[PDB]
A paper describes a structure:
Instead, we obtained crystals when malonate was present in the refined crystallization condition and successfully solved the crystal structure of malonate-bound ACMSD at a resolution of 2.21 Å. Malonate shares similar structural features with ACMS, possessing two carboxylate groups but with one less carbon atom in between. Binding of malonate induced minimal structural alternations. However, residues within the active site underwent substantial conformational changes to accommodate malonate. Specifically, as depicted in Figure 3B, the side chain of Trp194 rotated approximately 90° to form an H-bond with the carboxylic group of malonate. To facilitate salt-bridge formation with the ligand, the two conformations of the Arg239∗ side chain in the ligand-free structure merged into a single conformation, and the previously missing electron density corresponding to the guanidinium group of Arg51 became visible. The malonate-bound structure demonstrates that the active site’s two catalytically essential Arg residues act as gatekeepers, preventing the substrate from ligating to the metal ion.
ACMSD, the enzyme responsible for decarboxylating α-amino-β-carboxymuconate-ε-semialdehyde (ACMS) to produce α-aminomuconate-ε-semialdehyde (2-AMS), plays a crucial role in controlling QUIN levels. With the cavity of ACMSD, a mononuclear Zn2+ ion coordinates with His9, His11, His177, Asp294, and a water molecule (residue numbering based on ACMSD from Pseudomonas fluorescens, pfACMSD). ACMSD functions as a dimer, with residue Arg239∗ from the adjacent subunit being crucial for the decarboxylation reaction.
Residue numbers in the entry:
A (entry chain A), B (entry chain A): 4 to 333
The structure:
Amino acid sequence: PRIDMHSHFFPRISEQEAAKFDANHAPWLQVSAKGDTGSIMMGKNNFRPVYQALWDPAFRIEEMDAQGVDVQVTCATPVMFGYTWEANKAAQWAERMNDFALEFAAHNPQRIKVLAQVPLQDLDLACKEASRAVAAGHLGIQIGNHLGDKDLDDATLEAFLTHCANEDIPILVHPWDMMGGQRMKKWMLPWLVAMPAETQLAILSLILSGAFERIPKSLKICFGHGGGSFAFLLGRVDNAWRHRDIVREDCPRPPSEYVDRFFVDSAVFNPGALELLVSVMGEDRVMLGSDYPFPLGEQKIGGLVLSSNLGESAKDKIISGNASKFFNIN
Amino acid sequence: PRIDMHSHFFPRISEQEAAKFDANHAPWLQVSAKGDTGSIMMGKNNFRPVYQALWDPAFRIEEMDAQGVDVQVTCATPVMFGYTWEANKAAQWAERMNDFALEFAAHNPQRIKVLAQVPLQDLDLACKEASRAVAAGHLGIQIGNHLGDKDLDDATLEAFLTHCANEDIPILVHPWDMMGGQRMKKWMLPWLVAMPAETQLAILSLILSGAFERIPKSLKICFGHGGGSFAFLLGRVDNAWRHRDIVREDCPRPPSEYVDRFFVDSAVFNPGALELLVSVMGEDRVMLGSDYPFPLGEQKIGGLVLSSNLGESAKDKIISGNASKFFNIN
Ligand SMILES: [Zn+2]
Ligand SMILES: [Zn+2]
């Protein structure tokens, strides 16, 4: 069988629905002109054109059959996170969005699994929504990689991971709200430079802060897009750790030794990069993920892993065996 | 023989010398307490502790003998760039610094080669200093990777590369003045996350802008630290280019096809990363570089390349043959 554990949905939310939370900032879906083109909206302004597989589970199931994807885990589009909003408002938003998700999956719950969002700007609310959404059927949580200037080393965010660790709740960390200023205005550079940097920064924030020394081993956590550039730049991190005490101050072992504490998806779009990723992380900690249905995703889902020269025992863990164990899927 | 083409110096500049350009912003060297520890200074404030190999060519030659480095190409520490200063002031600074460099190399010009800086905030001055410094003995130019929000696609910076291309002047691009805001305050994250991102951004700015379609093939240009994360994230760039017209708008061929237009050093601190780097760039376009004498440099210069399983014909191009041809060294 074949699991795709990285994919997005966006719910059919009317403009009126969105306007009851925040007319200016709550995103909604406009399936207009000829109803296979939509645009995520915000207030009266467009935000991103999207296509119908983002919102239509019946359509999506047929693309899945075409691709050969038995089970697809899917979760919020990051524009739905709402980490800027007032806490209680965002906890209500998260709850709605996660009901939408379970409604999306209900069309075929055996083949469409969902992960939840949480109102991460309030730790108590966020832990509550995580437990409630997993009880209601979500298989885990998807969070953005940072909360403004708080990166994953910040005690609030570490405490959220530790809550999920203590409840067997898995987490997918997705880059979002990208660093950069005004420098990456063309050619989708934020997605090519800032996004992998964001994800590396999140992994290094956990490692170099010594967060894995405090977070129980039971945490199941996965970083999108192969972990960004993390695996390629790891030798540079180890070298810095061996030669500067300020890099060692909170991290008592070589940084590269902490790759037995997390997972990455396989979406690196290159056979040599995949071979290096599996060399660094081990065949047990890479899961097939496509970023479906977005353009910078993998158009032939699983094609990179299947066409590699990894042993077939490795190919089976990545396309299937690892995400069965990680999310608890049959 | 063995060339190390990435290394830094800093001149014995007094505080009084620095204060005649700018007391607050011009950096100077304080070889104090016990004269093998110095600190780069700025005004009355410290900036970075450095050790004597940064400023002492006689000392440096003995470390070179110890390491087995026949020829070392060295260039400014990026804090000496002065890209913020008023143009004419900075052109005078650059000229002084480049005289210092030739004075540094004069102690053994056959084994110490120098690259120059330029006052990149004025294109006419910058082209003039490049030609004058190469005529006086520099083997090329080292520039920072961006000038504020102008990245290498900006016409000013492309015109500077094109000037050097048309005069057979080689260039080393070094990351500096790192993106990030207030998010990377600990554990030297700017050097681990922002620096490789900066260098990838510089390479992608040339490729995706179509600058290599305008810059003559004669340009010899090298990017520090293996090109940052560029080589690992290249498949992700190609995928984006195949699937979004805005990524193609200025770049008429697949981005990965432009790796025959530039060079990288070999400083990636990991055998798998080096193998992938040589797979992407080819054995002809990677040059041994150490970042000597800094802590995040390679402590056993050339040890990574020599201990690899590259063919010995590949090991010879990288440690020696490529930088002989790139800088014109015997
Ligand atoms: Zn995604
Ligand atoms: Zn350097």
